[PDB]
Structure formats: structure tokens, C-alpha cells
Write an enzyme that holds these catalytic residues in place. Structure first.
Site, mmCIF file in Angstrom:
data_model
loop_
_atom_site.group_PDB
_atom_site.id
_atom_site.type_symbol
_atom_site.label_atom_id
_atom_site.label_comp_id
_atom_site.label_asym_id
_atom_site.label_seq_id
_atom_site.Cartn_x
_atom_site.Cartn_y
_atom_site.Cartn_z
ATOM 1 N N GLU A 1 0.808 -1.217 0.000
ATOM 2 C CA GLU A 1 0.000 0.000 0.000
ATOM 3 C C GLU A 1 0.851 1.283 0.000
ATOM 4 O OE1 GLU A 1 -2.601 2.700 2.646
ATOM 5 O OE2 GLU A 1 -2.977 0.591 3.213
ATOM 6 N N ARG B 1 -7.036 3.872 14.299
ATOM 7 C CA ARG B 1 -7.961 2.762 14.133
ATOM 8 C C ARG B 1 -7.993 1.845 15.367
ATOM 9 N NH1 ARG B 1 -11.321 0.179 10.393
ATOM 10 N NH2 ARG B 1 -10.867 1.922 8.968
ATOM 11 N N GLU C 1 -11.067 -7.252 5.596
ATOM 12 C CA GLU C 1 -10.344 -7.190 6.892
ATOM 13 C C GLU C 1 -11.116 -7.612 8.176
ATOM 14 O OE1 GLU C 1 -9.550 -2.985 6.205
ATOM 15 O OE2 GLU C 1 -7.488 -3.358 6.912
#
Ligand SMILES: Cc1cc2nc3c(=O)[nH]c(=O)nc-3n(C[C@H](O)[C@H](O)[C@H](O)COP(=O)(O)OP(=O)(O)OC[C@H]3O[C@@H](n4cnc5c(N)ncnc54)[C@H](O)[C@@H]3O)c2cc1C
Ligand SMILES: Nc1nc2c(c(=O)[nH]1)N[C@H]1C(S)=C(S)[C@@H](COP(=O)(O)O)O[C@H]1N2
Ligand SMILES: O=c1c(O)c(-c2ccc(O)c(O)c2)oc2cc(O)cc(O)c12
Ligand code: MOS
Ligand code: FES
Ligand code: FES
EC number: 1.17.1.4
Lengths: 305, 164, 745
Positions: free
Chosen positions: C232, C310, C691
Site C-alpha cells: 500500500e 484505528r 479485513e
């Protein structure tokens, strides 16, 4: 079938067609590396940046490929693939009384979750032996069983049971410069003789600190009285070692809870690790040495029930 | 001075007149022969992405033997008079898929697809030796093959179809 | 219309036949060269000299490249705190110093090994513990707080406090990092073939490096053999060095990393340390929670700040906690910069939450399922970050999993096995999860598509998302087929490229189906509206006849489509605004048997119930659940990265790093998708699946702990309400040592 020569940028490879060529080549080039499966040498050249400018491949030689069923055991040529050894031993185990196949069964346990089919179809027996990794899963079984090694040079020939002296130091074995390993006789087990093998199932370092063992007990005819006892461990030093001091003390003792705690006391001292011992996991490794023996202890009793 | 190396790949004769001892079969397949189905996933014999089938007449046993090998560790100089089969040697979407290829595809056993040829060649090899294997023989064939994507369940389930 | 059908992955047949092309399968140009990175062997040191004398004697050696060769800029990375090539000082083992270029990859390998660097060691900071002791952090403390903490604790019957560590994880995508760079020779133009989830940053980082406008750089991504977060942003480490070599030589250049280089250089999941204090009632009801999180970020920021955010958003898992304080800090260390890994900080935080929840249950001497259920959110509840839980389906998932797994019956049988066995023990646990769907950075929640209908009526779809195995292109084809009302055989997706869809977000946060699905849908709607008159003119005609009529009437058969996720914008200052669009929910129940004497274990059975809304493709979605679960089982039970004290990675290949094998999966492995639960918030009532299932892997960890608990109750000090520390991963070492007995002593 004739000798082939291949020449590259850094390396000369000779494919030997006969035993004589091999022994002649190894005499001329004592340092030459013998490649069969390449599952060790290919790793040393890629990842340890080693250069081996002379390679002899003996995989074609009939004598290094022979499987021979004798009175004392089954003999495998040094170039026999591990899957061939497995298949021959699985065939012997299904055909012979259980009391003759205790060692074969140990070898087969070590071979079970040992890599995959791809590696086992090309990895040689002799390769695993002469490589002499501290964490070889086969050397402790071969040592514990006194598996007989036929070693050969140009002219000279010898057969030695594998014992503690065969691995003098890190990645070294007791063969002279001109010598090769020719065959490996794995013995049938005797009446009142029992055998186990166990191994650690993780590991985080390249060739150290993974506990692996062969264990063998021979009792006096119809007794529980120890005549011979062998405990060989990999993953506990720079080489495959035998707990001689501990096992010597058990000779002519009986197989009881007393034997248990004494061996567990002997193992703890004899195979003790300094806190700075390469590979770490010091408490785990120590505990496995005793836990494996305890499994062997218990299995030996059930095999006597 | 230097001998010719002669092998076969997917039924075709390969004559190497200047074999370098350091060259792996994976390198040869991918970078000389242009057969890119066989993959590099580790180079150290642990993932099976590079799995191919090798075949030879066993002088001792008499017969032709078939077995799987990691092309990343196979020196080409060990392959004189050996026959290599790769994923492209067994079937193609341009001609016809091998049943092993169809079933892993249709069973959702391939996600990113990078392990698929290796696993195909593992199953294929098994079937060349044992056309009616057991469930246990099936799981066993793949001890050398890693997949990061599928969690393995679909691959075994699609191949169970070959057992009994 | 195949939406809701188990259509196999579009490329699977070609993947099975070895015809699917990955980056290094692209043929080489006649003049194509090969690059290999030259990397630090020291964790922290000054570079004294670099000597290339020996490298130059290697056959086919072209050049050595270093910071001095760069035309544009040596500063790179998401927050501009990295070098392309280290100049005076290295800050981790693996730190990129330069590259050799050669005529073959074998020659580049050989030349790279013989590059001689001289260092002067400087003192290094490797562990989270080291970083805390030195106040070696990136940025400042992150914090979410709700309620009154000094009221909750004043009120609590009991407390549990402790410390937990969770190790990192290497991505182990089967295809490692790979870039081909083709210099065009005109105006600095370059075309790049790259295994990356982020063609936008690739493109932007190459241009910055080169000193060239972004419009000169074309990045193309057919597919990756896995990415999992690891491609990523960290894919640019290879891409930028390869671009530089192409620029310097004027030749095409490629590099694919060997596994050992990839493991060392490109970063993994963030290790987490947590210190926690939970206050609760005799009932097991939670009244206060205070958790301080520390991540090992490594030697640059990269995505670490968002990963901690997160984590903080998921420190509640599925539990209502009236009074709560979570803090995060990012530890600046001399290790490879850590990055996105499937879950993106969620599994770490969720694991911390289940760890103390499990200790609450032990302390109160209640059944674990009872304490979890009684603390569970209810429909309409607000989270600690003040977002409402609408369509909270964990209660359904829990109830259905309990029923279909036969949990209460098997719990009885586990207990019987435990009383009847000395040196083997069974454990059984059932765990919930919620996972919030959206990038927590609002601006990334945008997606573009571009659709062409050609005059034969075949359709070419292009969208900003990439394929890494997750079946995104398959899903987009099903969407377009449904929206256009034509069969899937008329539609094709070839690749992702910066010249068809610009400024795309990384393919990440599990949202790709949602956002590109919407972009594709809008573009299809535009096409249908343009075709409508022609349909009316030729009502018994075919798609092909309608397209050709539109063409001949000079109606454009090309359009863009765009989506911007509405109503996102969480503020850490006001503790308000939605951080996610919706949540994905799931429950797993797992049983294990441990070998008390070896620390080995067997996964016996697992049952999962997952709310993925109305699935676009049940086969892909189940495949995603099983894949994620097994990656999670590896994270918590198998995979362990191990470093020398000097900070050099030991575990660099499949022989020292064990990801799950064919034999690691549960013998009985059941996955069901929750029925009749449409999600109003996403395309065709579906939900993100990539995920959210991974953390369910932890169910195997807590089953292991449950079994260790039984082993201890047999052989050690017998307190039923006895707690012990078990970090992640639970390897055979940790499992064995925790089974204290007459041998460990
Ligand atoms: C992924 C993988 C997993 C593995 N797992 C295990 C494991 O679990 N347990 C374990 O014990 N091992 C393991 N190994 C090692 C494997 O068993 C050995 O690598 C193999 O037996 C070596 O045999 P080879 O024919 O491939 O050796 P080669 O690489 O060809 O040679 C190895 C060494 O043996 C010498 N040699 C070979 N034949 C003779 C001869 N007859 N006389 C004198 N010297 C000779 C060579 O000169 C060389 O030094 C693993 C290897 C791989 C790649
Ligand atoms: N086969 C496969 N599945 C995968 C991945 C992958 O690399 N391969 N990446 C995961 C990660 S990290 C994410 S964020 C999602 C991204 O894809 P999506 O948004 O299309 O679900 O897929 C997941 N599932
Ligand atoms: O994958 C992600 C990612 O890359 C970023 C991010 C943040 C700041 C940037 O400047 C940037 O380029 C990316 O945020 C995220 C936030 C999430 O909640 C989940 C994710 O998966 C990502
Ligand atoms: O958001 Mo996935 O790339 S970690
Ligand atoms: S590339 Fe991994 S085994 Fe050959
Ligand atoms: S399908 Fe991706 S590694 Fe197997």
C-alpha cells in the site's frame, strides 16, 4: 552412462558415472563438494554467500542408490532420496513384527512433518548426515540407534556405528579428506529393545536451538533392568550430542519413578545451557529435554505392559 | 572441453551446450525458456511456488518414476536425461484445462493465484503416481505448498472429488 | 444478473494454468537490466565509506547508484521523513543505501553482496520499552475519552490491571515486491509495471524523485500475488530505486525482491504494547477502562498514525463501557518502518480488549460467554467515539453461532476431556468482533471509474482499485453486468492505471467494493441514459444494435463515474462526527487440544457466523472470511518475528517464519454468512468483508489460554481465579512454559 563436465563462470561440475570416478575425483579434489539434492549446498551458496568452485554430483552411481535388506538391518546408498528411505521403511514396518521395527518407526516419525514431498524426493540421506546441522532430525536417531556407516576412499573401506565421536565439532564429521559416505545400515530392533523419537515444532534461528532427539533402551531378557540406554539430542549444542554421563548411571538400574527423576536430574545438569546460549529459548529447550524423556519413559512402560 | 546437457521440458528437447553449474531450473524455465507459470516465492525450498514434476526411467526399479521437486533448488546440471513437466505442460485455457486445473479454479481454491501452479503440480504429481488417492494422501501432497490467501479449505474440498 | 451468485474469480482458470501474468512474468526487453538493493547491516550508524571495487569486477556489472545520483529529490515517504537512498547515516538494518544494476539478476545479486560499506555504530533504540524510556516518539499522544473515569473506578467492585504485548507479522504475500520501469527517452516520460495497491503514490513518489511533473509518469497494475496492506505504500521503496536506475541508464530496469530482502526491508504489522486497568462489578459488568497503547512504528511515520487511530476506535470491541480512556503513542525505533497489514491496527486493539475481558470473567468466576454477552452493546447504542450502532447484528451472529456450533454441549465435553486427561487439555472460546468501514482519513473515501462501450457492444471497465486476489475485478464485473443489464461475458477489466483513473486512493480499508462499486454503477447509469432513446426506437433489438445506433448518432459511449462517501468526519477535539460509514460484524467459536508436554496444539474445530449484508458473491466472501481468519490464526498462534539484540532480523524465510500450512487449519472449519441482513449503506446492500474477519482468528488464541488454564489447574497452584500473562503469539514455547509442572520446575 558416462562422465559429464559442465563449466560456468565460477564453478566446475562433474557428473560422476561410476564409483571409481567419484573416488578418483575426491582424491584429486579433496575439497570438492558432493551435490545430490542441493537442498543444503544451494542454500549455502545463495544465503551464506559461500563459493564452492568444484562440485561432483554422484547421484548416478549404482552403489550410492542401492537398497539392501540384510540380517542386521536395511542398508541405503548415501544418495537415496528421503522419500525412498521413507517408502522402504513404511514397507518394512507393515511386513515385519513390531519388535523388529522400533528404529524404523523412529526414523519414520522424524520424516513425517519433515519439509514436504518436493524436498523429500530430492534430499539425500548422506546429505542430511554429512551436512551435520546441530538441528538435523535424523542424526540423533542414527546416533541413538548406532546406525552403521560405510565410509570409502580410493582403496580403503570401513564401517563404523554412529556414536557421539562422529560429530567432533560444528558442522564437522569424522571422515578424512578423500573419504565419502557410501551406505547407511539402519538396524532392526531387538527383543527387549525399545525406541522413540521426538522433535520441537517451531524454531526461529537458522540451524540452532530446535530440540530433536532419538531415545533407545535395551533391557535384560524379559526384565525392566537397563542394559543399554541412549539419549541423543540435536538443538542443544553446536552439534548432535549424547547424554552419556546421565545414561551411564542408569546402567543395570530398573525402569521406575526413581529412574525417571534421576535421568531428569542428569539431563538438567549434563545438557545445561548458559543464559547466553545461541538461539535462546533456554527454559523451553531445557523442559523439552525432560518432557521428551518423560514421553519415552511412559511409552517404554506401555510397551512393557 | 564441456559436455552438452540434454533434458526435456513439457515433451520438448532442451539441449544446453554451455550449462552453468549455478543455474537453477527455475531460472532456466523462466528466463531462458520463457515458461513463466512456475513462480519464485522464497528460493529456499519452503513454499512450493516453484513446484514442477520430474520424470525419469529408474534403472534400478526398472520403471518410469514421477515426482515433485522445487525448481528453485534443482540445479539444471542434475537433469541430464530427465523430463520436466510444468503447469503449462498439463493444460491451458487456449486448448483444454487439466481436471486438476479446472477443479481448483471452479472450487474457489485460487484467489491471488500465485501459489496455484505449484499446488496444481503437487496434485498432478500425486495423480500420476496414484490415480485414485485417499483423502489423507491428498492433504499430504501439499505439506510443501503455502497459500496466504485462501485458508486452504477450498483447495482440499475441490480436490477431495479425486478420492475414493 | 449474477449479483449474489458464487461466480468464481474471473482469473482463476488462468491462474490455475499459469497463464495469468504477474509483474516479473512480463517479458524482458532485449536491453532490460536488473536492479538489486544494497542495504544497511547496522541498526543505527554513520556511513563512513562505500567501496564498489569488487562489484565492478562482476561480469555484467553496469553501475552502483546512491543518493548523489538522484536528479530531483532524496526526500520521500508519506510524511517526507524518509530517504530514497540513505546519505550519511543508516537508521535500521535493511535501510536502503544504494543499488547495483547488472545485466542479469544473478549478476546483480553477486555484485550487491560484494559492495563494502564502512560504518561507525551509533546507539540504537529497538524495543518499545527502549523507546518509552527515551521518549522516542512520533508526534504526540492520541486520546479518546468518554464519561467520568474518576467516578467509574471509585464505584468499581474490583479492578484488573496488567501489561500485554502482541508481536508483528510479515505479510508473506506469495509474490514479493516487483517493479519494471521503462524510460521512454522523451520529456522524462516513464511507464511502470508494479505490484502495488497504491499506483497514485507510486506515481507521485517517482515524479518527486525524478524532479518531473506527475503527468510524465504512467503506473500500471494488472494484479498482485497478494498485498495485504504491505504493498500500500512500501512498494515505492523498490519502485523509486528502479525508476532511478531506468532514468540513469536510459534502459528498461526491473527488480523483484528475494523473500529474505522483502522480509527485512519492507515492514510488517505493528507490534503493540498495552498497559490496562479495568474496573468492574461482581457481576462482570464493566464500569471503567483505561488503556495506554504503544506501537512499534520503526524508522519512519508511514501509516503508523492512522493505524493507532484505528486501534483506538476499536479498543471497545463489541462492549459498552460508560467510562473509558484510551491513549496511543507511536514509538520511533531503529527498525524497518512498519505499515498497513490487514486489520490496520484493529486486531491489535481488539485483542487487548478480549484479553482483559477474559481476565474480568476469571476474576468474577463467571462463564466467559456470560460476561461478554452482558457487556455487549445494544442496537442504537453509542460507541466510545459517540457513533450510533445501527443494524448492530452481533446479537444475531452470537445466538446463531452458539446454536450451530453446539457451544454449550461441546463445553460440557471439553470439561469431561479435561478431567479424563493429564498431559493433553482442550479449550473452547467464543468471541465477537465489529470492524468499522471507511478510511479514517475522510479524503481517501473517494473513488473513480471510467467505462467505454466499443461499437461491437463490448464494454471496458476501468476503476481506481487493484486486484490482489480479493476478487474486486470480479465484483465490479458483476455490478456492471447487473447495472447495464447485459451478461458478464460482454464486460472486461484489463488493469488499473493512472492514465484512466487518476488520484486514486490505495486499495485498502476493505472499502474498495463499496466505493468502486458505486463509481462503476454511476458510470453505467450514465451509459443507460444515453442509450435509452435508441432502445425506444428499436425495442425488439439487441444491445449491439442499440450501441451502434448511438454511435452513428454521435452519442458518446464513454463516461466517468465518481463516488464520495457521505457524512464522514470524526473529530478528536469534540469526540463527534462519524468515523465509519457502518460496521461489519462476526462471531467465531474455536476449539483446540494442547499437548501440555510439548507446547504443540491441534485446531480441532471452528465455526464462524459473519454479517456481510447481502453478499455480491457468497463464494468470494466466504473465501475472504476463511483467508482472513487463517491470517489471524497465524498472527496470534504461529508467526513470530525474532531480532538480534543489535536489531537485525533473524526470521527471513519460510524455514524460520511459519505461516499457516495445509495442516494448520481447523479439522472442522465452518463459515456461514448471516441471512436476511441487507445493508442500506453500501452497493446492492452488501458489506465490506476483506479485513473484518481476521481478528476472529483470536478465538483460537483464547481457546489455547482456556486449555492452559486447565493444565495449570491440574499441575500448579490451583486458584480458579488465578491470572497469568500470555502475550501474542502463543507459540509452542510460550504455551509450554505456561503449563508450569514438575518439568518446567
Ligand atoms: C525447506 C527444507 C526443509 C528442511 N527440513 C529439514 C528438517 O526438518 N530436518 C532435517 O534434519 N533437515 C531438513 N532439511 C535439510 C535436508 O534434510 C537436507 O538438506 C538434505 O538431506 C541434504 O541432502 P542433499 O542431498 O539435498 O544435500 P546437498 O545439498 O546436495 O549436500 C549436502 C552436504 O552433504 C555432502 N554430501 C552429500 N553426499 C555425500 C556423500 N555421500 N559423502 C560425503 N559427503 C556427502 C555434500 O558435500 C554437502 O556438504 C530441510 C531442507 C529444506 C530445503
Ligand atoms: N486474496 C487476498 N485477499 C485480500 C488481500 C490480499 O492481498 N489478497 N488484502 C486484504 C486487505 S489488507 C484489504 S484492505 C482488502 C482490500 O480489498 P477490498 O477493499 O477490495 O476488500 O482485501 C483483503 N483481502
Ligand atoms: O490504508 C490506509 C491509508 O493508506 C491511510 C492514509 C492516511 C493518511 C495519508 O496521508 C495516506 O496517504 C493514507 O489511512 C487509512 C485509514 C484507515 O482507517 C484504514 C486504512 O486502511 C487506511
Ligand atoms: O487496508 Mo488493507 O491494505 S491493511
Ligand atoms: S520458490 Fe519457494 S520453494 Fe522454490
Ligand atoms: S491464492 Fe494467493 S497465495 Fe494462494
Amino acid at each position: 552412462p558416462k562422465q559429464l563436465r559442465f563449466e560456468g563462470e565460477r564453478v566446475t561440475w562433474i557428473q560422476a558415472s561410476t564409483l571409481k570416478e567419484l573416488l578418483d575425483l575426491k582424491a584429486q579434489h579433496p575439497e570438492a563438494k558432493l551435490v545430490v539434492g542441493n537442498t543444503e549446498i544451494g542454500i549455502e551458496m545463495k544465503f551464506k554467500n559461500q563459493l564452492f568452485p568444484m562440485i561432483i554430483c554422484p547421484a548416478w552411481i549404482p552403489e550410492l542408490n542401492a537398497v539392501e535388506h540384510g540380517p542386521e538391518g536395511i542398508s541405503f546408498g548415501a544418495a537415496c532420496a528421503l522419500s525412498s528411505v521413507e517408502k522402504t521403511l513404511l514397507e518394512a514396518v507393515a511386513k515385519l513384527p513390531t519388535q523388529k521395527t522400533e528404529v524404523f518407526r523412529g526414523v519414520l516419525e522424524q520424516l513425517r512433518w519433515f519439509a514436504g514431498k518436493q524436498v523429500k524426493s530430492v534430499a539425500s540421506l548422506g546429505g542430511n548426515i554429512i551436512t551435520a546441522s546441530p538441528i538435523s532430525d535424523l542424526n540423533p536417531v542414527f546416533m541413538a540407534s548406532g546406525t552403521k556407516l560405510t565410509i570409502v576412499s580410493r582403496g580403503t573401506r570401513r564401517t563404523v556405528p554412529m556414536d557421539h565421536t562422529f560429530f567432533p565439532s560444528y558442522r564437522k564429521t569424522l571422515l578424512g579428506p578423500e573419504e565419502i559416505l557410501l551406505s547407511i545400515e539402519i538396524p532392526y530392533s531387538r527383543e527387549d529393545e525399545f525406541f522413540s523419537a521426538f522433535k520441537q515444532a517451531s524454531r526461529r534461528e537458522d540451524d540452532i536451538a530446535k530440540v530433536t532427539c532419538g531415545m533407545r533402551v535395551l533391557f535384560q531378557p524379559g526384565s525392566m533392568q537397563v542394559k543399554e540406554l541412549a539419549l541423543c539430542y540435536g538443538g542443544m549444542a553446536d552439534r548432535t550430542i549424547s547424554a552419556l554421563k546421565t545414561t551411564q548411571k542408569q546402567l543395570s538400574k530398573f525402569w521406575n519413578e526413581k529412574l525417571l527423576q534421576d535421568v531428569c536430574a542428569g539431563l538438567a545438569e549434563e545438557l545445561s545451557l548458559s543464559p547466553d546460549a545461541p538461539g535462546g529459548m533456554i527454559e523451553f529447550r531445557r523442559t523439552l529435554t525432560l518432557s521428551f524423556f518423560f514421553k519415552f519413559y511412559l511409552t517404554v512402560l506401555k510397551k512393557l505392559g | 572441453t564441456a559436455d552438452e546437457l540434454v533434458f526435456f521440458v513439457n515433451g520438448k528437447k532442451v539441449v544446453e551446450k554451455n550449462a552453468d553449474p549455478e543455474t537453477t531450473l527455475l531460472a532456466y524455465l523462466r528466463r531462458k525458456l520463457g515458461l513463466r507459470g512456475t513462480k519464485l516465492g522464497c528460493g529456499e525450498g519452503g513454499c512450493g511456488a516453484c513446484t514442477v514434476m520430474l520424470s525419469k526411467y529408474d534403472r534400478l526399479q526398472d520403471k518410469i518414476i514421477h515426482f515433485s521437486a522445487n525448481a528453485c533448488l534443482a540445479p539444471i546440471c542434475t537433469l541430464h536425461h530427465v523430463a520436466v513437466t510444468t503447469v503449462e505442460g498439463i493444460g491451458s485455457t487456449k486448448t483444454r484445462l487439466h481436471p486438476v486445473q479446472e477443479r481448483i479454479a471452479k472450487s474457489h481454491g485460487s484467489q491471488c493465484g500465485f501459489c496455484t501452479p505449484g499446488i496444481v503440480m503437487s496434485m498432478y504429481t500425486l495423480l500420476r503416481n496414484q490415480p485414485e488417492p485417499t483423502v489423507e494422501e491428498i492433504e499430504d501432497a501439499f505439506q510443501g505448498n503455502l497459500c496466504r490467501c485462501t485458508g486452504y479449505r477450498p483447495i482440499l474440498q475441490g480436490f477431495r472429488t479425486f478420492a475414493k | 444478473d449474477t449479483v449474489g451468485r458464487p461466480l468464481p474469480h474471473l482469473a482463476a482458470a488462468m491462474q490455475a494454468s499459469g497463464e495469468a501474468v504477474y509483474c516479473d512474468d512480463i517479458p524482458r526487453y532485449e536491453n532490460e537490466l536488473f536492479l538489486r538493493l544494497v542495504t544497511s547491516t547496522r541498526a543505527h550508524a554513520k556511513i563512513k565509506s562505500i567501496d564498489v571495487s569488487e562489484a565492478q569486477k562482476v561480469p555484467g556489472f553496469v553501475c552502483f547508484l546512491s543518493a548523489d545520483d538522484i536528479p530531483g529529490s532524496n526526500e520521500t515517504g508519506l510524511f517526507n521523513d524518509e530517504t530514497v537512498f540513505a546519505k550519511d547515516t543508516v537508521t535500521c538494518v535493511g535501510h536502503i543505501i544504494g543499488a547495483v544494476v547488472a545485466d542479469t539478476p544473478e549478476h546483480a545479486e553477486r555484485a550487491a553482496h560484494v559492495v563494502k560499506v564502512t560504518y561507525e555504530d551509533l546507539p540504537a533504540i529497538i524495543t518499545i520499552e527502549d523507546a518509552i524510556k527515551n521518549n522516542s516518539f512520533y508526534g504526540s499522544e492520541l486520546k479518546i475519552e468518554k464519561g467520568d473515569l474518576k467516578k467509574g473506578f471509585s464505584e468499581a467492585d474490583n479492578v484488573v490491571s496488567g501489561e500485554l504485548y502482541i508481536g508483528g507479522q510479515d505479510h508473506f504475500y506469495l509474490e514479493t515486491h516487483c517493479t519494471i520501469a521503462i524510460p521512454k527517452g522523451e520529456e522524462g516520460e516513464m511507464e511502470l509495471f508494479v505490484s502495488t495497491q497504491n499506483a497514485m503514490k507510486t506515481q507521485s513518489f517517482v515524479a518527486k524523485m525524478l524532479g518531473v511533473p506527475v503527468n510524465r509518469i504512467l503506473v500500471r497494475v494488472k494484479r498482485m500475488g497478494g498485498g495485504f496492506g504491505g504493498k500500500e505504500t512500501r512498494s515505492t521503496l523498490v519502485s523509486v530505486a528502479v525508476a532511478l536506475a531506468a532514468y540513469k541508464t536510459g534502459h528498461p530496469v526491473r527488480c523483484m525482491l528475494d523473500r529474505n530482502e522483502d522480509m527485512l526491508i519492507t515492514g510488517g504489522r505493528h507490534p503493540f504494547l498495552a498497559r490496562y486497568k479495568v474496573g468492574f462489578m461482581k457481576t462482570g459488568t464493566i464500569v471503567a477502562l483505561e488503556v495506554d497503547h504503544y506501537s512499534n512504528a520503526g524508522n519512519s511515520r508511514d501509516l503508523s498514525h492512522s493505524i493507532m487511530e484505528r486501534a483506538l476506535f476499536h479498543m471497545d470491541n463489541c462492549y459498552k463501557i460508560p467510562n473509558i480512556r484510551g491513549t496511543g503513542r507511536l514509538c520511533k525505533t531503529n527498525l524497518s518502518s512498519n505499515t498497513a497489514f490487514r486489520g490496520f491496527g484493529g486486531p491489535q486493539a481488539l485483542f487487548i480488549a478480549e484479553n482483559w475481558m477474559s481476565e474480568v470473567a476469571v476474576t468474577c468466576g463467571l462463564p466467559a460467554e456470560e460476561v461478554r454477552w452482558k457487556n455487549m452493546y445494544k442496537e442504537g447504542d453509542l460507541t466510545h467515539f459517540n457513533q450510533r450502532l445501527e443494524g448492530f447484528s452481533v446479537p444475531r451472529c452470537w445466538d446463531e453461532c452458539l446454536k450451530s456450533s453446539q457451544y454449550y454441549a461441546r463445553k460440557s465435553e471439553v470439561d469431561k476431556f479435561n478431567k479424563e486427561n493429564c498431559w493433553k487439555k482442550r479449550g473452547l472460546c467464543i468471541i465477537p468482533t465489529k470492524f468499522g468501514i471507511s478510511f479514517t482519513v475522510p479524503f481517501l473515501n473517494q473513488a473513480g471509474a471510467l467505462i467505454h462501450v466499443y461499437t461491437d457492444g463490448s464494454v471496458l471497465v476501468s476503476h481506481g482499485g487493484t486486484e490482489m486476489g480479493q476478487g474486486l475485478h470480479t465484483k465490479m464485473v458483476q455490478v456492471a453486468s447487473k447495472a447495464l443489464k447485459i451478461p458478464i461475458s460482454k464486460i472486461y477489466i484489463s488493469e488499473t492505471s493512472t492514465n484512466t483513473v487518476p488520484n486514486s486512493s490505495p486499495t485498502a480499508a476493505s472499502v474498495s467494493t463499496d466505493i468502486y462499486g458505486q463509481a462503476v454503477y454511476e458510470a453505467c447509469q450514465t451509459i443507460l441514459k444515453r442509450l435509452e432513446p435508441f432502445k425506444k426506437k428499436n425495442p425488439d433489438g439487441s444491445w449491439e444494435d442499440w450501441v451502434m445506433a448511438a454511435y452513428q448518432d454521435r452519442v458518446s459511449l464513454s463516461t466517468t463515474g465518481f463516488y464520495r462517501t457521505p457524512n464522514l468526519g470524526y473529530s478528536f477535539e469534540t469526540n463527534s462526527g462519524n468515523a465509519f460509514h457502518y460496521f461489519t460484524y462476526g462471531v467465531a467459536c474455536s476449539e483446540v487440544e494442547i499437548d501440555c508436554l510439548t507446547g504443540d496444539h491441534k485446531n480441532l474445530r471452528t465455526d464462524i457466523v459473519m454479517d456481510v449484508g447481502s453478499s455480491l458473491n457468497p463464494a468470494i466472501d466466504i473465501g475472504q472470511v476463511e483467508g482472513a481468519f487463517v491470517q489471524g490464526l497465524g498472527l496470534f498462534t504461529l508467526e513470530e518475528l525474532h531480532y538480534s539484540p543489535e536489531g537485525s532480523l533473524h526470521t527471513r524465510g519460510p524455514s524460520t517464519y511459519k505461516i499457516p500450512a495445509f495442516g494448520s487449519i481447523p479439522t472442522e472449519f465452518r463459515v456461514s454468512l448471516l441471512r436476511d441482513c441487507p445493508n442500506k449503506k453500501a452497493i446492492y446492500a452488501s458489506k465490506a468483508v476483506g479485513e473484518p474477519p481476521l481478528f476472529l482468528g483470536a478465538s483460537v488464541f483464547f481457546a489455547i489460554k482456556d486449555a492452559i488454564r486447565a493444565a495449570r489447574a491440574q499441575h500448579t497452584n490451583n486458584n480458579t481465579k488465578e491470572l497469568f500473562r500470555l502475550d501474542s503469539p502463543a507459540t509452542p514455547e510460550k504455551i509450554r512454559n505456561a503449563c508450569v509442572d514438575k518439568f518446567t520446575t
